[PDB]
Ligand SMILES: Nc1nc2c(ncn2[C@@H]2O[C@H](COP(=O)(O)OP(=O)(O)O)[C@@H](O)[C@H]2O)c(=O)[nH]1
Ligand SMILES: [Ca+2]
């Protein structure tokens with residue numbers, strides 16, 4: 001005999017820094033033959049977050065006390081047409097999202113677009129520290145869900161077009177780390193095939209030193 | 220030739236690599252120096268009575284790992300790991316610089332001093348306790364500096380030389 005439960009989330013909208021918006025417009029609108037590198041950039045970013053756990057451990061030994069494995073999980077979903085990458089890294093604060101994913105990537109942003117103009121391949125994006133935006137080669141929408149110790153769960157979301165949102169996330173608690181959800185373009189469902197994902201990870205990532213596990217839905 | 224120590228100054232853009240180097244070499248403070256200019260600067264010093272040249276590599280340019288860049292950074296006998304006390308990201312990046320030195324010198328036993336720069340400014344975001352906790356974990360000294368006032372500058376470079384004599 002209870003009243004209707006209802007959760008509330010505050011949502012804020014942000015403009016991308018002009019140069020990140022230019023790069024995102026270039027990535028979304030142009031066909032790149034080597035676009036499979038998007039998955040290497042996701043795995044490499046998860047690896048950076050897992051390294052931050054170990055760094056923090058040096059000076060804050062309580063990190064050692066978590067019983068969570070440091071790992072990366074790949075979860076294609078053909079029904080939803082999503083590729084989800086989950087890691088147990090340190091996660092981001094709300095300030096990180098507003099900054100890390102819409103402003104602080106700004107210096108290699110301009111340098112990468114001049115590298116492309118000079119004839120460099122899309123595969124160089126990772127060396128300019130802006131590999132995250134390669135998700136827009138294959139995804140029409142990206143959601144990032146993240147949890148940092150002593151902070152709230154946040155969702156970042158953008159379909160490009162010059163802005164992103166950040167909100168408190170009252171959904172499924174994910175525990176410490178980051179989940180990236182690629183809503184794939186209709187024509188990019190090859191990247192949900194177990195065989196294609198095995199090829200791409202056998203090729204690119206090579207020497208990331210955290211376990212990677214592909215979860216395949218039994219048909 | 221004469222006794223030379225090759226010191227490399229590393230750390231995030233804007234921490235004061237060039238300001239510390241110029242304060243040491245030319246005893247004045249620069250309010251803005253081209254962030255892309257990578258040079259070595261030489262100065263004769265006397266440290267615990269020994270006369271030597273400090274050859275200071277003021278790291279700049281862009282982040283890349285060409286064989287040329289690796290060989291050049293490998294000649295460094297000692298490294299100043301500089302962060303700014305009002306810039307939390309610069310402190311977090313110390314782990315990156317430590318990794319790359321560890322990498323080209325294939326050792327955890329490279330002479331290094333951790334330097335907390337811009338100690339004159341009131342807008343601290345990184346506590347000294349965190350910096351000393353990090354220095355302790357690496358087994359390296361930690362110096363507070365202000366390139367602006369020259370407080371700690373000679374202390375930081377001379378400590379690094381002493382660190383290189385021990386190793
Ligand atoms: N207040 C203060 N400003 C500093 C100090 N050291 C450097 N700066 C300033 O911070 C900016 C970056 O210095 P710079 O040496 O070019 O940094 P670099 O990018 O690491 O070489 C310049 O505007 C400097 O004047 C310091 O100790 N105190
Ligand atoms: Ca890195």
Ligand SMILES: [Mg+2]
Pocket residue numbers: 236237238252253254255256277278279
């Ligand atoms: Mg400089």
